[PDB]
Amino acid sequence: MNDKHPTPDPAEDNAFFPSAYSLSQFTASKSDLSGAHYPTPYQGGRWKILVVGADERYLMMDNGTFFSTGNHPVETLLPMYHLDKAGFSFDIATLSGNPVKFEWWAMPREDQEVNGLYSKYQSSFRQPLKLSDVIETALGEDSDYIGVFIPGGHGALMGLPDSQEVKAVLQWAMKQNKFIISLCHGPAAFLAVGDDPLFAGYKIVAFPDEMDAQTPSIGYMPGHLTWKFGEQLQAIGFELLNTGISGQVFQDRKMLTGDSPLAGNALGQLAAKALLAEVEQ
Amino acid sequence: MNDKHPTPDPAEDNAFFPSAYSLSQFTASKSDLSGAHYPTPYQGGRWKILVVGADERYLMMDNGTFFSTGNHPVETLLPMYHLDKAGFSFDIATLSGNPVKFEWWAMPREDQEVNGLYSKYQSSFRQPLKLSDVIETALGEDSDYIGVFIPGGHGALMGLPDSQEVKAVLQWAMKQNKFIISLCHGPAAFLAVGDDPLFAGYKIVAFPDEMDAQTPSIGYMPGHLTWKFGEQLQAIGFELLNTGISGQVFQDRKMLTGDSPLAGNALGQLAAKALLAEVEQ
Ligand SMILES: [Ca+2]
Ligand SMILES: [Ca+2]
Numbered sequence: 001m002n003d004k005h006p007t008p009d010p011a012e013d014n015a016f017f018p019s020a021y022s023l024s025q026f027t028a029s030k031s032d033l034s035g036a037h038y039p040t041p042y043q044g045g046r047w048k049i050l051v052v053g054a055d056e057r058y059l060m061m062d063n064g065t066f067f068s069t070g071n072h073p074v075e076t077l078l079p080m081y082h083l084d085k086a087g088f089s090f091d092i093a094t095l096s097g098n099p100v101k102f103e104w105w106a107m108p109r110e111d112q113e114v115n116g117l118y119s120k121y122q123s124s125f126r127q128p129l130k131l132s133d134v135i136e137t138a139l140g141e142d143s144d145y146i147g148v149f150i151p152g153g154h155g156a157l158m159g160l161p162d163s164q165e166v167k168a169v170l171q172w173a174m175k176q177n178k179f180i181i182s183l184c185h186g187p188a189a190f191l192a193v194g195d196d197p198l199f200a201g202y203k204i205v206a207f208p209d210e211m212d213a214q215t216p217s218i219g220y221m222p223g224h225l226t227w228k229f230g231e232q233l234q235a236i237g238f239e240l241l242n243t244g245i246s247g248q249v250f251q252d253r254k255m256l257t258g259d260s261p262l263a264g265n266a267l268g269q270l271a272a273k274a275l276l277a278e279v280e281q
Numbered sequence: 282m283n284d285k286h287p288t289p290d291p292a293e294d295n296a297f298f299p300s301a302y303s304l305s306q307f308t309a310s311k312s313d314l315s316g317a318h319y320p321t322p323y324q325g326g327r328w329k330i331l332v333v334g335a336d337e338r339y340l341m342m343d344n345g346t347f348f349s350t351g352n353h354p355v356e357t358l359l360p361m362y363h364l365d366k367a368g369f370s371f372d373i374a375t376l377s378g379n380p381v382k383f384e385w386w387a388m389p390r391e392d393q394e395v396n397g398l399y400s401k402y403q404s405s406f407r408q409p410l411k412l413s414d415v416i417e418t419a420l421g422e423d424s425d426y427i428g429v430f431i432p433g434g435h436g437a438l439m440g441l442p443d444s445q446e447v448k449a450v451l452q453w454a455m456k457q458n459k460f461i462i463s464l465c466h467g468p469a470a471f472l473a474v475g476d477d478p479l480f481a482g483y484k485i486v487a488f489p490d491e492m493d494a495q496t497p498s499i500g501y502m503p504g505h506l507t508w509k510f511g512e513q514l515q516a517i518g519f520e521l522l523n524t525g526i527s528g529q530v531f532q533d534r535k536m537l538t539g540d541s542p543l544a545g546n547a548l549g550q551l552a553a554k555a556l557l558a559e560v561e562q
Contacts, residue, residue, distance in 0.1 A: 011338065012382075055379065099339050126347070
């Protein structure tokens with residue numbers, strides 16, 4: 001019937017990609033990548049950013065259907081594109097060690113830059129590191145990581161929110177005064193700290209729970225979320241600054257966040273700027 | 282229809298379902314489920330069977346492509362169907378806690394009984410237990426599990442083969458003299474014991490490595506497997522009984538195995554009979 005009806009995903013029974021209508025409204029063939037040139041990039045070849053991606057594509061909705069989601073490609077690749085041009089490298093990990101799952105329906109197919117960057121890291125996205133291995137060997141006081149990046153997309157709502165491994169990564173980042181970068185639903189991962197109040201008083205921007213309750217009306221999702229990461233984040237001490245979305249980014253000490261799928265470019269510029277200043281002395 | 286070109290999976294880039302031709306030869310609209318009749322089933326309400334399923338659908342081939350696989354639905358459901366009728370219940374788990382991934386292209390869409398069983402267990406396949414929790418509170422000397430079932434499908438080749446968690450489960454099963462039920466590629470999970478000579482001298486049937494070497498020739502998979510589970514199994518003590526496949530099964534003490542996607546029904550009968558005789562003593 002309607003272009004607003006969820007689109008069946010052939011690989012999983014009772015699973016759906018966003019409706020044709022929502023895709024035309026919420027995705028585009030090109031990204032708005034801009035100002036990604038850095039005249040004095042980091043050239044030390046040491047500092048890297050740890051990327052923690054979603055290893056699951058199917059998210060259970062309140063009505064039993066699966067939302068065929070995963071990490072948002074634009075939210076993931078724009079920040080990475082800027083950091084790449086800034087001279088930084090990446091290690092990609094998932095909780096299980098299984099492939100990072102992208103919402104391919106949001107990939108800007110006509111964007112040469114974004115597609116070129118994915119291809120650059122495709123072997124890592126497809127065969128990522130298992131977070132437990134990273135925790136056991138690449139963190140600590142002498143880590144080569146200058147920060148951690150947790151991309152958005154509803155895929156970040158699975159596993160990451162209550163993973164004891166993610167908790168360890170976040171505590172490490174805070175303990176070693178490392179950058180924590182995330183946007184949209186990515187901050188849901190912060191809930192991994194459980195009852196630990198290490199994020200008390202922090203200000204961030206994140207996708208509004210209010211909007212998650214509305215997007216299903218046009219078939220962006222085949223149902224509604226079974227919980228609210230925003231209210232949960234507020235429960236552990238976070239202050240959510242944005243009522244709506246406009247690509248706004250915020251920096252609270254070393255916590256850098258973006259508000260939605262509109263903040264990829266701005267977050268990339270902010271992170272690149274922040275990390276570059278950090279490496280210079 | 283006769284097309285032997287792997288079929289692109291829309292949900293994942295460079296991922297492929299079996300070719301239309303291989304599907305017409307290796308899958309059917311109906312299963313050969315039969316003889317699932319046990320006049321005096323187990324009604325003690327205690328003994329259950331733990332199912333360790335595949336949580337990943339995308340398997341990396343030797344040529345960079347992803348085989349869109351997972352657990353084989355017929356191999357999974359026929360054994361369960363017989364055991365269900367025999368009066369046993371199931372607990373379904375995956376390593377990550379993520380949903381069990383089925384090779385839906387092998388699901389017999391016109392098999393009313395098979396689809397009826399899936400309906401009964403869909404909530405468990407879709408929101409399975411996390412194996413780590415199972416090991417922590419449901420095993421031990423007083424477990425309610427009478428056996429473990431590890432279904433086939435190439436998805437069994439991911440994570441399970443070198444999982445310390447699967448190792449614990451196998452060590453427990455052998456120590457507590459529990460049934461271990463598997464077929465086709467499921468035995469690859471037995472490799473999880475690593476270097477524990479636990480299965481030394483056991484006889485099993487499993488999918489022939491040499492057949493795996495040939496199915497890609499008709500587009501069943503988009504490439505070839507990066508390793509051979511059969512040789513690895515022999516390397517840890519197993520005597521592989523079958524050279525080819527015919528859907529036969531073998532019982533060596535409490536180790537029950539099927540040889541391929543043709544062994545689902547026979548394995549259900551073998552397992553149901555062994556477990557029923559067990560509980561009847
Ligand atoms: Ca989104
Ligand atoms: Ca098969």
